[PDB]
């Protein structure tokens with residue numbers, strides 16, 4: 001009755017409470033070695049970390065400005081054990097500058113751990129790491145999918161409310177090296193100049209129309225090499241497409257080079273498009289950095305590096321992680337309405 | 353009730369018997385496309401004895417039509433599905449299902 | 460002689476204190492014994508400590524010391540505490556039998572009409588009014604050896620021992636004429652006919668190999684577990700004395716508690732009361748087969764137990780089980796069309812030998828003294844101490860009979 005199979009690690013039970021997670025830099029190595037073993041933190045410490053990260057992010061502008069040596073990444077979707085592999089294949093946060101693009105939480109079983117780790121590391125390093133807001137940081141979307149249940153099962157709902165008040169204030173433009181432009185999705189016809197995205201407010205839930213809901217939801221055309229700005233979309237049903245003439249006009253009106261994206265998951269992890277004849281550089285690069293998306297596609301991932309006017313692309317691998325039941329059940333609710341049916345059937349069969 | 357809309361058929365010489373056990377790989381869904389289970393989440397298939405009441409009746413009436421190595425797209429109406437009582441934690445009452453069962457081997 | 464008879468009395472105090480205490484300990488310790496008929500049993504044990512210490516041993520001094528130095532300052536006082544021991548114990552014994560009668564003749568009326576918070580009020584109401592009658596001449600002295608003329612002896616005989624030994628022996632004769640009918644009323648013979656039809660051994664012994672002979676049951680994943688929950692006698696086979704109880708554990712008039720307890724007993728493996736990791740792995744592995752892996756099952760079990768512990772020891776009990784499962788509506792999914800609730804008759808052959816020992820022993824004294832009151836007097840003037848001592852032993856065995864019951868027995872071994 002001690003243990004039937006002993007070849008599996010045991011999850012620690014004691015939640016840390018400001019013991020060694022704070023020293024005003026917060027500790028990181030213990031966060032590593034404790035979150036890799038499915039442990040939990042005290043509620044007060046989680047509120048402290050999230051609110052401090054939100055306080056740091058509040059004062060950030062609406063269009064980031066960064067120097068040259070950067071390491072762009074892609075969306076993650078809450079896979080912790082692949083986030084660690086990404087941090088190992090890239091550089092340590094002390095030695096290299098990052099820029100994340102995609103959403104951080106939905107469609108995974110380890111959203112809260114990923115967001116805690118990232119926001120703590122942003123608190124420690126306030127100048128050599130930047131984050132961007134995606135489509136999956138709203139109220140309706142995370143209420144629909146499996147994020148509210150995560151916060152309601154592992155933690156209290158106060159954590160979830162504070163986490164929303166934390167997501168509310170992220171930046172959304174991410175200009176880089178005064179040459180490129182890295183937005184989460186795609187541009188929109190209603191937005192023309194770079195200065196035009198320096199006035200809108202991002203301190204609220206996105207609406208259903210306008211530039212705010214067109215930046216984070218747009219998609220590129222999927223039939224490049226065709227005939228002749230604002231053709232409607234079908235798969236998403238909420239935003240607009242855009243064509244090559246629109247991109248060329250935007251890149252000629254304002255002196256830029258290209259635009260980067262983080263939506264369209266691919267079997268190779270990256271895929272460029274036709275080179276612009278004006279300069280020779282490609283005009284759109286799509287990055288995906290979550291291997292085995294939904295555990296079905298069975299694809300690789302990638303992470304883009306940029307230095308010394310050389311644009312090289314590095315590939316990526318997979319990694320294993322533990323198991324959970326769908327929608328976070330427990331074995332009693334999992335297997336009571338089978339015991340009931342079996343017992344009743346046997347009794348009715350024997351008493352007759 | 354139960355419907356079958358074949359996606360990519362194949363050979364149809366062999367049919368399941370009265371009391372043999374089948375092996376399947378399935379990917380549950382709901383009407384709007386949200387997924388809630390899979391047999392590829394874990395790396396092991398599903399087995400069940402046809403003819404006895406340990407699977408919902410929709411499967412027991414539908415899977416018998418297909419043969420070895422065919423995929424399909426079932427549709428379980430609320431009658432043969434979990435019904436008004438439903439299940440606690442996953443399936444709300446009066447909920448349509450859309451599976452992706454693809455019979456693999458016959459024992 | 461002297462040292463040896465002293466040894467008997469010294470053992471006596473020790474035994475009464477011991478047995479009267481052990482029951483107190485078991486009732487207070489577990490929370491499964493807090494039934495409506497386990498507080499009145501505690502009042503009997505406590506009026507068995509009071510006459511377990513102050514009253515039994517002081518009389519003991521009087522045996523041969525020929526005088527009590529406690530003196531008149533309270534020597535008559537002893538006389539009060541003694542007569543507030545027989546007169547409470549008899550009133551608490553009469554409540555028990557009239558209430559078992561109201562529950563059993565119509566189960567629903569007791570099942571819902573009264574609550575534990577009113578019972579403590581009734582027991583406090585019993586002890587003290589009895590104390591009031593006794594104290595009345597204990598100081599009025601209407602009357603260390605006790606004598607009176609004719610009055611107080613007649614009054615004491617007319618009130619506590621005679622009047623209670625009439626009511627308590629009549630309502631219990633009802634519970635016994637109106638409880639044998641339900642045991643054989645047109646419906647507990649159907650299952651008997653089925654029993655006689657089903658046993659191939661022709662010996663009244665239904666072994667598991669005999670239920671496995673049915674045609675449509677030879678594939679059910681869990682038959683051993685249920686047949687071992689039925690196996691209360693703990694020998695590996697089912698007989699008629701417990702089959703009826705096992706079936707009647709399910710009914711339409713049953714409540715939440717017994718059904719949910721039975722659902723609990725499916726997982727528990729050794730009737731200890733605690734679910735461990737091995738138990739909640741084996742009971743589930745049998746029901747899951749080979750669709751999941753093994754390590755995944757172990758990991759989900761670990762997570763469930765870790766989210767289930769609120770006491771820190773690492774195992775789950777019934778209250779935590781109710782905290783986790785409560786809200787799934789399992790009570791409506793276990794129903795069979797059998798109509799009889801043989802739950803009241805579970806304990807009526809142990810709360811009934813007591814209403815007998817307390818009448819077969821202190822009846823002689825009251826009988827003897829009223830005779831000694833009469834003019835005729837034998838050479839048995841020392842018999843009052845020969846036979847009103849018979850009694851102090853009675854309070855001694857009042858907890859001894861209780862070890863037959865399973866709930867007390869688990870604590871008694873524990």
Ligand SMILES: C=CC[C@@H]1/C=C(\C)C[C@H](C)C[C@H](OC)[C@H]2O[C@@](O)(C(=O)C(=O)N3CCCC[C@H]3C(=O)O[C@H](/C(C)=C/[C@@H]3CC[C@@H](O)[C@H](OC)C3)[C@H](C)[C@@H](O)CC1=O)[C@H](C)C[C@@H]2OC
Pocket residue numbers: 334335337338341380388389398406407408411433434435439442746747750
């Ligand atoms: C461990 C103990 C249970 C043991 C569970 C397993 C072997 C693991 C197995 C992968 C189940 C999955 O567990 C992750 C999970 O599969 C689902 O996701 C699912 O896709 C589903 O609907 N399936 C599974 C594939 C066959 C069809 C159907 C089913 O036949 O399910 C059956 C079922 C629930 C019967 C109900 C019972 C209640 C009645 O009221 C109702 O009658 C209308 C019918 C299965 C075969 C039962 O036998 C359950 C078991 O034997 C359910 C949404 C929820 C279910 O978990 C419960």
